[PDB]
Amino acid sequence: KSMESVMVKYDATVRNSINQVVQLRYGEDGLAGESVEFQNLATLKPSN
């Protein structure tokens, strides 16, 4: 009943039923979560 008020918009910004902006873009990237995957960055490697 709470979360039904919100949807994604075509300008990538996340907005509500009264068109106000929730986010600059959905998940701060606008990309699909399904296309996300677990990865090691490994740049936090111990020795410089």
Partner 1 sequence: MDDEEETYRLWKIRKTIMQLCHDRGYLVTQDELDQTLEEFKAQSGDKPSEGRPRRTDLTVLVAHNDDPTDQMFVFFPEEPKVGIKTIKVYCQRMQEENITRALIVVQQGMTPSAKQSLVDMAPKYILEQFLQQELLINITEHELVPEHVVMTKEEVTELLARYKLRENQLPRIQAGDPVARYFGIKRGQVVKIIRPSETAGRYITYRLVQ
Partner 2 sequence: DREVLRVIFPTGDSKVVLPCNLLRMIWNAQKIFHINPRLPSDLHPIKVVEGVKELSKKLVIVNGDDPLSRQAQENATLLFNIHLRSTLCSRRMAEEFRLSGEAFDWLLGEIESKFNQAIAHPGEMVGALAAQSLGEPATQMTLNTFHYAGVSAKNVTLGVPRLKELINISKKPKTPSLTVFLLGQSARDAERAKDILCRLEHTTLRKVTANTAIYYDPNPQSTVVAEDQEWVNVYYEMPDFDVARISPWLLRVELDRKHMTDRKLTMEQIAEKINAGFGDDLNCIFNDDNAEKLVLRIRIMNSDENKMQEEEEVVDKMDDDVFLRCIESNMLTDMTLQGIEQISKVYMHLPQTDNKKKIIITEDGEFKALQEWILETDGVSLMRVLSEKDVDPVRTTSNDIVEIFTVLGIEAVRKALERELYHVISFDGSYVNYRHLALLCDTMTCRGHLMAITRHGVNRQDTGPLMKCSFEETVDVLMEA
Three-state DSSP class for residue 15: strand
* CA–CA separation, 25 and 14 (whole Å): 6
What sign does the CA torsion over 3, 12, 24, 19 have? negative
Q: Does 19 bind partner 2 (CB under 8 A)?
A: no
Q: Which does 19 bind (CB under 5 to 8 A by kind): partner 1, partner 2, none?
A: partner 1
Residue that the structure tokens 């873009």 belong to: 25
Question: Using CB under 8 A, which of 28, 32, 44, 47 touches partner 1?
Answer: 28
Positions that interact with partner 2 (CB under 8 A) = 1-12, 14, 16-18, 20, 22-33, 35-48
Q: Site residues (CB under 8 A) for partner 1?
A: 11, 15, 19-21, 24, 27-29
